[PDB]
Each structure stands twice: as structure tokens, then as C-alpha cells.
């Protein structure tokens, strides 16, 4: 029996141009928004930190390649077990 399970590792990383998003490049709107403090800079820093943390997490997850010994699996049948469904097909017509 085969149990299928999905474990997410990423989300779409979004950076928002807070000034353009809020004011659409209007001087009056920017002057009125300046009364709210440092909102846009804080938003930018928060999004940048989230994206940086996601980048480090994904790099940490993928770092297992550098320190993992493997063996070259035979293409198609590995003994009597058929692993063609899980192997990357090799075609010399174009790029891998």
C-alpha cells in the first residue's frame, strides 16, 4: 500500500512597494501618510526578513545534498524493481 503525503516547504515570496501601493506616487497622499510614522520602512523590513528566513530555511533543507553519499541507480529496472516512474528520463535530443 502506498500512502501519499504532501509537506510544503516554501511559500511565494512577496515584496510590496509600500509607498506606491498606498499612495500611487501622489505627493499629497505621501504628505498625509508621513503622519503615520515609519510604516513603509517597517513593512519593507518585515517582508525582507520573512523572505530571508525562507531562503535560509530552504538552503538548510537542500544542504543535505553536499553531505549525502549515493549510488548510481540503473535506468529502468533496478534488479527486479521498476523505478522508471521516479527517475528523470535521459534524452540526448536536447537539454537534460
Amino acid at each position: 500500500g502506498v500512502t501519499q503525503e504532501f509537506i510544503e516547504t516554501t511559500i511565494q515570496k512577496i515584496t510590496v512597494d509600500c509607498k506606491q501601493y498606498v499612495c500611487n506616487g501622489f505627493k499629497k497622499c505621501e504628505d498625509l501618510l508621513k503622519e503615520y510614522g515609519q510604516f513603509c520602512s517597517k513593512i519593507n523590513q518585515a517582508l525582507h526578513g520573512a523572505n530571508l528566513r525562507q531562503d535560509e530555511s530552504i538552503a538548510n533543507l537542500f544542504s543535505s545534498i553536499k553531505t549525502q553519499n549515493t549510488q548510481p541507480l540503473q535506468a529502468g529496472l533496478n534488479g527486479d524493481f521498476n523505478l522508471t516512474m521516479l527517475q528523470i528520463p535521459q534524452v540526448t535530443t536536447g537539454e537534460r
Binding site: 510590496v16 509600500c18 519593507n44 523590513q45 525582507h48 530571508l52 553536499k66
Partner: protein, 384 residues
């Protein structure tokens, strides 16, 4: 980020350079709206006001307002000054004879017989209420005998006094009954209905002062396709075919205004609409008079990413998701140094990568196992 000391990384930055903007004006040719019935004959009574609706014409509000001495110009969701420089899908004017001494009775939410039985203003659209005095020099408008407004409009039942009230912007139910004018104060008119009840109205008659006074209720509507009712302006029809392209302009096209950058774009959209919108009601395209479809983008649309290395104190720019040729031809959006570097064909010119156009980079065969400046899609920025 409002930080003098920024750490090493790749950042999404805002645009702070302000560049001069042109103007893109495209106005449809239309006739002139005629306010002549408003300026001739005797003005109607308040309960029997006259409505003028203007569509696909050019209005000169200065000409109309220069013939009157305005005493009150209360407006809602629009300004009196914007009423003369704005474009509308329709322009409705309700005008009647009204004494400015009765100004409080025409106000929103006011009590009395004026709102109940004569005229209730409608506030579902941007509307302006103008109370104006007709000067004695203007002889085209004739002073009526008196000012007449209804004090009652009810159906007399067995219990009696079933008062009928005006709908916002509509006429009184006793309009046909009040067709015969009220010669005396507190004169009553009664009509027999087939149900057996009597419809009764009463009018208040008071003399007109030294100068006749009118009331104008101007209501406007705004359309997203074409605001045909536009002011008479001598503005030229600018051409964006060669000039004002790929640069920020302040456009006013067939009543739609805003700021944006216009690009050449293959005609995509509905085959009848002049303006093209996306699912979020953003003006995306525009079919121009010259038969060319233009492809509207905001003033700041290109994503700019700055790659900073603190140790080397060196920075580079990545124009995410943009081709380098478009970056070059659309240089009037970035910082002054970026504009200068795009104007002059520098040898470290724009470079096309898999994550967008790169400025300040060079193609390299170097392969790394880790980096502190990842550009995305297995790309790393190697600091100088």
C-alpha cells in the same frame, strides 16, 4: 528601509526620483449644452420644477454662473470648482423659483413642507445645491407674480390625513391637482378619486421681493467608459505616438484622468470599449484616436532590486521581470544615477538574466556552493 547602515542582501526598493510629466489629452468633439430654458421665461414653482438632463455635450458653467448672484453653493461628494472642470456621463439640473430667505427649508434633512411636499434632494449621486439671485439687468427671466409652494398633499380617508411625501428627486403626487395655480394664500384644491377618497393639496403664496431668486440642483454622474459631458476647454489633442511615450504623463482621456506610462501594445480587450480594465478595475489599456492601442502602466511599475555588499561597499541593480531593451527605452523612472548609466552606453550595460534585467553585472562561468546574495533561480551575485 530608512536605514543608513543596511546589511548585505538583495532588497526591493521604492522610487524616490520625481521626473517632470507631460500631458496626454484626448477630448471627444461634442455640441454645446443649452441652458437656454433655464435663462428664459418665468422660472417654475418649486413643486413643479423643471429638469434638464445633459448627455454628450459641452457645458460652460462659467457662463451660467456669471448671470446669477450666488448666495449658497452647498455641494455633496463634489466641489463647486470641480463642477466646472470635470467630465460626466450625465448632468442633471433641477431649477425652480425659490426665495433665499427659505434657505433652511431646502437643506438636507430639513423639516417643513418644502421637503415633504415640494422638492426632496437626491443624494445618491454627487449633487450641488445653488441658491442664486437674478439681477435686474438680466431681463430674459421674468419675475412671477408670487412664490408658491405646497403645504399639504394628502388623501382624505375615513380617518383622514394620509399625507403623501415626495420621493428624493421626484415630483409630488399632487402635481396634477396643483396644475391650476394658487391665486390666494392657503388656497386648497380637492380631487375625487375612484376609491371614494379625496386628494387634497394646499399652497402658500408669498410675494417675490425686489429681485427674483432661483434654486439650482445640479447632480452629476461619473462613468468608467466615457464622460461625454465635458467642459468647453481649448486644450489641444496631444499626440503620444512619438513623444510622451515610455514616460510618465498626466492624462485626461474622454473624461478619465490619472497618471500613467503609455506603451505600444497589441490591441487586446473588448472590441467596443475605449478603455481596458483588469479584474481589479485598473486602467490597463486605452484605444487612442490615432488607431493605436496604448498599454497603460502606473508611474512606478518596474520592480527595482538593489544588491548590496557591505564589505565591498558596492551595489548593483536588478530590474526584476523586465527585458533590458524595455529598461533602456523606459529609463525615465529610476534614480538619477540609473538614468545617467542608461543614457550613456556604458560597457557594464544592462544584462539579461533568468530573473530580469541586471545592471552592474557580468556573465560569469563561476560555480558556487553557497552565497549571501541569491538573485533567485539558482543565481548568486559575486561581490567585486
Amino acid at each position: 528601509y530608512e536605514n543608513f547602515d543596511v546589511e548585505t542582501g538583495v532588497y526591493s526598493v521604492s522610487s524616490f526620483e520625481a521626473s517632470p510629466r507631460g500631458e496626454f489629452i484626448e477630448q471627444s468633439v461634442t455640441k454645446e449644452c443649452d441652458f437656454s430654458p433655464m435663462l428664459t421665461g418665468t422660472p417654475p414653482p418649486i413643486y413643479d420644477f423643471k429638469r434638464l438632463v445633459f448627455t454628450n455635450c459641452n457645458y460652460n458653467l462659467t457662463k451660467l454662473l456669471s448671470l446669477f448672484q450666488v448666495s449658497e453653493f452647498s455641494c455633496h461628494q463634489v466641489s463647486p470648482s470641480s463642477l466646472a472642470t470635470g467630465c460626466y456621463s450625465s448632468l442633471t439640473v433641477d431649477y425652480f423659483a425659490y426665495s433665499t430667505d427659505m434657505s433652511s427649508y431646502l437643506q438636507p434633512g430639513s423639516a417643513g413642507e418644502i421637503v415633504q411636499f415640494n422638492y426632496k434632494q437626491d443624494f445618491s449621486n454627487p449633487t450641488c445645491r445653488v441658491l442664486a439671485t437674478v439681477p435686474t439687468n438680466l431681463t430674459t427671466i421674468t419675475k412671477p407674480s408670487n412664490y408658491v409652494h405646497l403645504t399639504e398633499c394628502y388623501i382624505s380617508t375615513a380617518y383622514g390625513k394620509n399625507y403623501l411625501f415626495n420621493a428624493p428627486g421626484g415630483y409630488t403626487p399632487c402635481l396634477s391637482l396643483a396644475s391650476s395655480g394658487f391665486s390666494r394664500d392657503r388656497q386648497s384644491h380637492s380631487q375625487e378619486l375612484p376609491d371614494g377618497s379625496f386628494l387634497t393639496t394646499t399652497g402658500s403664496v408669498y410675494s417675490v421681493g425686489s429681485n427674483l431668486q432661483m434654486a439650482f440642483i445640479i447632480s452629476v454622474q461619473y462613468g468608467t467608459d466615457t464622460n461625454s459631458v465635458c467642459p468647453m476647454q481649448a486644450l489641444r489633442n496631444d499626440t503620444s505616438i512619438e513623444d510622451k511615450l515610455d514616460v510618465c504623463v498626466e492624462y485626461s482621456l474622454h473624461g478619465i484622468t490619472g497618471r500613467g506610462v503609455f506603451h505600444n501594445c497589441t490591441s487586446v480587450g473588448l472590441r467596443n470599449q475605449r478603455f481596458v480594465y483588469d479584474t481589479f478595475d485598473n486602467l490597463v489599456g486605452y484605444h487612442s484616436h490615432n488607431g493605436n492601442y496604448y498599454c497603460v502602466r502606473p508611474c512606478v511599475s518596474v520592480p527595482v532590486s538593489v544588491i548590496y555588499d557591505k564589505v565591498s561597499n558596492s551595489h548593483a541593480t536588478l530590474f526584476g521581470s523586465v527585458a533590458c531593451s524595455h529598461v533602456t527605452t523606459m529609463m525615465s523612472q529610476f534614480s538619477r544615477m540609473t538614468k545617467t548609466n542608461l543614457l550613456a552606453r556604458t560597457t557594464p550595460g544592462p544584462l539579461q538574466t533568468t530573473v530580469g534585467c541586471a545592471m552592474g553585472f557580468i556573465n560569469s562561468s563561476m560555480v558556487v556552493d553557497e552565497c549571501q546574495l541569491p538573485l533567485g533561480q539558482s543565481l548568486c551575485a559575486i561581490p567585486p
